[PDB]
Amino acid sequence: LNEEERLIRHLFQEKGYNKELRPVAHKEESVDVALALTLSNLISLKEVEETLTTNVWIEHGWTDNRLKWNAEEFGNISVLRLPPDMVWLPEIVLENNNDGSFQISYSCNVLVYHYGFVYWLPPAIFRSSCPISVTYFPFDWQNCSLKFSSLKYTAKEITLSLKQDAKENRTYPVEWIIIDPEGFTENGEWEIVHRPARVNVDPRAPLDSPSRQDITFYLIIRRKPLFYIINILVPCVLISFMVNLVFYLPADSGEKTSVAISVLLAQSVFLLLISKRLPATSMAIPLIGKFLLFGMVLVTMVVVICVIVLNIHFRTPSTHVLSEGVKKLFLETLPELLHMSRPAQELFNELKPAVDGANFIVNHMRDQNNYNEEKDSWNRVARTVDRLCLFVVTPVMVVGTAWIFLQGVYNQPPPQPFPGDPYSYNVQDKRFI
């Protein structure tokens, strides 16, 4: 490499290149910096921390006329690799990081072409702030952004623009995140629906403010809910619906309240799990959380109903009076309305002690029969109440669960990345100048 040793010595020592001065003829001029983003891997979206971790390649392109040469003068060299600390740099950072890492991870070589174009494609692991919308979890879609700007320079000194490509000798801007098929790994949980890129200039900010300009790359990402469906929703929904079996359990089994409260405990453990997977924000209740709260309220109601049914079942003449109106309502009217199954002197004085005894025996058995019959009537009233409560509680739970989950099943990201803007920001639709 005699020739590019000569070229580097000519560019940097002979011409006295100063990397602290911008590449401009006059101080009033601005340096055009073209930016693009290539997503190699969406590493993660941590919902509790509300953080997006991405592996990206940040393409920077600008012109430095102090680094031009005639390739024929220097052995036909057309490109140079140089350390980035030898040349002026635009000093682009990720403004909306949430860990203090503003800069690219690895300061790779710049590529300097003989016509003065400086091309810099460093990689980076970026950790950015992504506020999470929890309303439709696990059927949710998210709207993350990666905002890039310069803190060392303002819109007066550099001018941010998007990378421009060419199709059939017609130039167009690259208004999207680039997905290189050779370098992209698909995320197993997150599908990229929209990936626009935008230059944002604040009209109200002064030109000498760093907040005047930025370039933002957005990721509209849809969660794949199959994992959460199979592993959480079907178990929780099945266990919750299992509580309705208590209305078909006989009161004499002695296990209705045990089943109902065990279902409540299972719902509480599910709530404990899902509360750890999402941030504790106050903007909305998660859909899974809404269903869990609905189910716990319904199960608490079912437990109270089981208590009432057990109370009615165990009533006896010695503590309660079975009114004829309650008898008619709960043993004739409701059972047919609900279509329940239905039933259907010396000898004299000598043996007088035995006759008096036998009459007392007869009265005892007759009274016991009447007592047992009233207890059976109370049991049947309890059965009727249980059947009515089944027919009332099961449809309510089914309808509420269907409503709650149909809110999330029909939740989709919008047809366009930006509401109110018809443009799609897709490579299929190039907006040629």
């Binding site: 490499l1 690895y106 692991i125 290189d180 299992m242 006989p250 089994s253 007869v362």
Partner: protein, 400 residues
């Protein structure tokens, strides 16, 4: 060593570490790259990140770093800070939460011929897509794609030192066995740089999990509870403990399913067979609970509330017990007049109670027969379901 001091002063008098180290710029710098795996530190399934400790051996000739040993007192090799010389800028493409390039700048061994050997250490935290299908009997395939970042193949060429990674100094893992390992060179055209292919060397490791821990701590309790769910069908209804046993088993299996949920990544590329086992067995336990509630309801039926349907009698008392072991048994004083009438009343009351008890016994017999049929159904269903889920992968491993 004064000779080495003079040599080092001479070598770097007008040396450039920016410029590629061959005599003419049209030549390609040939780099031999080899990877030594010292330890597989960790495989984070949930975050899908593999932490390895590695040595990234890199060999190449620097044209401007040669000398005659006879001019320097026989000095034939020296040790130089790596920061002083040109180096290849190797980058791990699939870095997840580590460094892209080498950060530990250890010294290089430089021979008098100009040959350089640089063996920096690194801890690579690389991305590896986790295939959850066969967990905890799963086999992973975790790659390390290493390539010069800014130099294309026409200026710098990288070649594998060996076909395989160097595992001679590999520390034994308590969780993984490296079944296979192989290094492949690739030339790739990226959309950013058309007409200039960039080279990479990808080292892939096929590693089989050692499943003993998850067998002891997850699968065995799950099997014990999934065996206990079916003993509910041999429990008497009058024990008043069927719901207790079945609901306890369901709660235990649900807790274990959530432990497994915490153990795997939350991706939808595939469903684990362990998760399928858990969902199927929990659905089976819930079906068992539903049928148990039906059985208890049937057992408590009496003529005071229901009447035996003829179809139920035909099916469960005539046909099903035929395929059974047959272990079941399928004079004018008012007081005197009142006393005799009362004795007759007692006798008729006992007769009616006997008839009602017989009808209730028929209902209880039907419940018992359903309980026996369901016990046998549990035995075959649970056994063949556990086999259908696990024996496939077990036979697959045994065949290998």
């Amino acid at each position: 060593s004064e000779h080495e001091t003079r040599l080092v002063a001479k070598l770097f008098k007008d040396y450039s570490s920016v410029v590629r180290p061959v005599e003419d710029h049209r030549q390609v710098v040939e780099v031999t790259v080899g990877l030594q795996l010292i330890q597989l530190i960790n495989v984070d399934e949930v975050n899908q990140i593999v932490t390895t400790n590695v040595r990234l051996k890199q060999q190449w000739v620097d044209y401007n770093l040669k000398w005659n040993p006879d001019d320097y007192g026989g000095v034939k090799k020296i040790h130089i800070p790596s920061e002083k010389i040109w180096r290849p800028d190797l980058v791990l493409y699939n870095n997840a939460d580590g460094d892209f390039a080498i950060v530990k700048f250890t010294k290089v061994l430089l021979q008098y011929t100009g040959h350089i050997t640089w063996t920096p250490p690194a801890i690579f935290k690389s991305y590896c897509e986790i295939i959850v299908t066969h967990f905890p009997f799963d086999e992973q395939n975790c790659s390390m794609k290493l390539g010069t970042w800014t130099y294309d193949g026409s200026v710098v060429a990288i070649n594998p030192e060996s076909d395989q990674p160097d595992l001679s100094n590999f520390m034994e893992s308590g969780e993984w066995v490296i079944k296979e390992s192989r290094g492949w060179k690739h030339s790739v055209t990226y959309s950013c740089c058309p007409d200039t292919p960039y080279l990479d060397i990808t080292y892939h490791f096929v590693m089989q999990r050692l499943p003993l821990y998850f067998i002891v701590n997850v699968i065995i309790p799950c099997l014990l509870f999934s065996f206990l769910t079916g003993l509910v069908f041999y429990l008497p209804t009058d024990s008043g403990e069927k719901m207790t046993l079945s609901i306890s088993v369901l709660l235990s299996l649900t807790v274990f399913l959530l432990v497994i949920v915490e153990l795997i990544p939350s991706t939808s590329s595939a469903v684990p067979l362990i998760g399928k086992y858990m969902l199927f067995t929990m659905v089976f336990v819930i079906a068992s609970i539903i049928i148990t509630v039906i059985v208890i309801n049937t057992h408590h039926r009496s003529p005071s509330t229901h009447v035996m349907p003829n179809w139920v009698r035909k099916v469960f008392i005539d046909t099903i017990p035929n395929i059974m072991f047959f272990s079941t048994m399928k004079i004018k004083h008012p007081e005197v007049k009142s006393a005799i009438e009362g004795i007759k009343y007692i006798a008729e009351t006992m007769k009616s109670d006997q008839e009602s008890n017989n009808a209730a016994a028929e209902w209880k017999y039907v419940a018992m027969v359903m309980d026996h049929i369901l016990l046998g159904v549990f035995m075959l269903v649970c056994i063949i379901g556990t086999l259908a889920v696990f024996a496939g992968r077990l036979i697959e491993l045994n065949q290998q």
